[PDB]
């Protein structure tokens, strides 16, 4: 067995959080990991034996202990919110895993309000790729977070081409109609549609919503959807 | 209307790279954006009208120069890799957009190097995600790159647990079985397959390959399959 404890931790973000492992398999090895998306599972510290520490591949911002074989534990002397994370301990000679410590690292003041200036400023598309059939109507979205917006233009984009406008919708109407393409703006949800009816293969492009304040003259992008319309 | 020059470009770490737009659109703001997967289009630097330059959201590296109405110029002194991508200048008062100019920038001898080394010590897997009906048989593939690795374990990893050891194959081999699990391996090409035949929904987990030097001491993890496993 390899045991850690504690198995779910919320700390706050300068504190100090001491995570334990101990095992019975009786090995001589015993490694600090961490789990996250797009990582899998990355080293943090190692022990070779009794009393002896190794760095891993990220060991920054952690220390460990190997006071005894039975014994290894992870040291976060400053925890950051970057250090929330499943944690697994391991021991080996051919390598068992402990059931992992979920750790959860809690911001700011500070933090919560610059990631709210954050948000305020950003334009976000979804989905970031949409595949329909022909004669589908395809259905692209849009929200924002200031309401100073008030011009939203939507553009077109064929592949080896730089963007041209499209569809645009000024926030005192709901809905903007132009042949196949409709607009639909809720200004109460900050939130628009782009409907392309009757959709076409050659209506296949990367489609940008942005949002424009017509009086601080400045211009936000959403990052893209990409259409596929297939025969 | 925005023109750009030039279309193509091949530049080396160390050099200097000229990006230029000529509009007709009589329009006193121009812009200098990137296009990257990932972060759409992002504003390098901006111009309200001829003798001014305004840097953007990302001015890091770049310089511009808006000697007269018609013409804005994007300057990188000291081109890295990292300023590959395509470049697109915009004109506005309502804005448009050229062409786009495709800008690679190589590539040193240090960095090649540098860049083998770490793929060297990387295990690969293949796909990410993996959906099957039941009953079908999952093959899941991983593959390596140094020819020291000689024991290659897989991982099973079930939601809110640590992996648990599946099946291993020593390189000495060249096929495992027990029971609905095979490894297939590829000694030659350094690839390895996991086939799990007749497969149930209890399979769905994520699968972690790792490849182990039994001499050298070193347990290298892939990032996983996610297998879903549909009734």
């Known amino acids: 067995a390899v045991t850690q404890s504690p198995r779910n931790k919320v700390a706050v973000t300068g504190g100090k959080v001491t995570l334990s492992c101990n095992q019975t398999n009786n090995h001589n090895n015993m490694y600090w990991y961490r789990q996250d998306t797009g990582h899998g599972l990355r080293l943090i510290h190692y022990?070779?034996?009794?009393?002896?520490?190794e760095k891993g591949d990220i060991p920054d911002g952690y220390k460990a202990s190997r006071p005894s074989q039975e014994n290894f534990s992870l040291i976060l002397e400053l925890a950051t919110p970057s250090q929330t994370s499943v944690y697994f301990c391991?021991?080996?000679?051919?390598?068992?895993f402990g059931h992992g410590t979920k750790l959860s690292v809690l911001g700011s003041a500070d933090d919560a309000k610059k990631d709210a200036a954050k948000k305020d400023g950003q334009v976000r598309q979804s989905p970031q790729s949409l595949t329909v059939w022909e004669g589908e109507t395809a259905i692209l979205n849009c929200?924002?977070?200031?309401?100073?917006?008030?011009?939203?233009?939507?553009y077109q984009q064929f592949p080896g081409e730089g963007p041209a406008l499209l569809i645009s919708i000024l926030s005192v109407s709901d809905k903007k109609e132009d042949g196949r393409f409709t607009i639909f703006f809720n200004k109460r949800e900050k939130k628009l549609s782009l409907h392309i009816a009757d959709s076409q293969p050659g209506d296949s492009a990367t489609y940008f919503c942005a949002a424009i304040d017509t009086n601080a003259y400045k211009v936000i992008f959403g990052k893209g959807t990409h259409l596929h319309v297939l025969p | 209307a925005v023109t750009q020059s030039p279309r193509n470009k091949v530049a080396v770490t160390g050099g200097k790279v000229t990006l230029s737009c000529n509009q007709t659109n009589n329009h006193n703001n121009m812009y200098w954006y990137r296009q990257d997967t990932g972060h759409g289009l992002r504003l390098?630097?901006?111009?309200?009208?001829?003798?001014?330059?305004?840097?953007?959201d990302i001015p890091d590296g770049y310089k511009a120069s808006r000697p007269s109405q018609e013409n804005f110029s994007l300057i990188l002194e000291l081109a890295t890799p990292s300023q590959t991508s395509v470049?697109?200048?915009?004109?506005?008062?309502?804005?448009?957009?050229?062409?786009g100019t495709k800008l690679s920038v190589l590539g040193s001898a240090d960095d090649a190097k540098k860049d083998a080394a770490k793929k060297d010590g990387q295990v690969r897997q293949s796909p990410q995600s993996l959906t099957v009906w039941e009953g079908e048989t999952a093959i899941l593939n991983c593959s390596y790159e140094?020819?020291?690795?000689?024991?290659f374990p897989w991982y099973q990893q079930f939601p809110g647990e640590g992996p648990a050891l599946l099946i291993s194959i020593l390189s000495v081999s060249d096929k495992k079985e027990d029971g609905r699990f095979t490894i297939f391996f590829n000694k030659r090409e350094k690839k390895l397959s996991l086939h799990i035949a007749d497969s149930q929904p209890g399979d769905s987990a994520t699968y972690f390959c790792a490849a182990i030097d039994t001499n050298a001491y070193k347990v290298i993890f892939g990032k996983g399959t996610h297998l879903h496993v549909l009734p």
């Open positions: 391991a021991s080996g000679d051919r390598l068992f």
């Open positions: 140094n020819s020291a690795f000689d024991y």
């Open positions: 022990s070779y034996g009794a009393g002896s520490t």
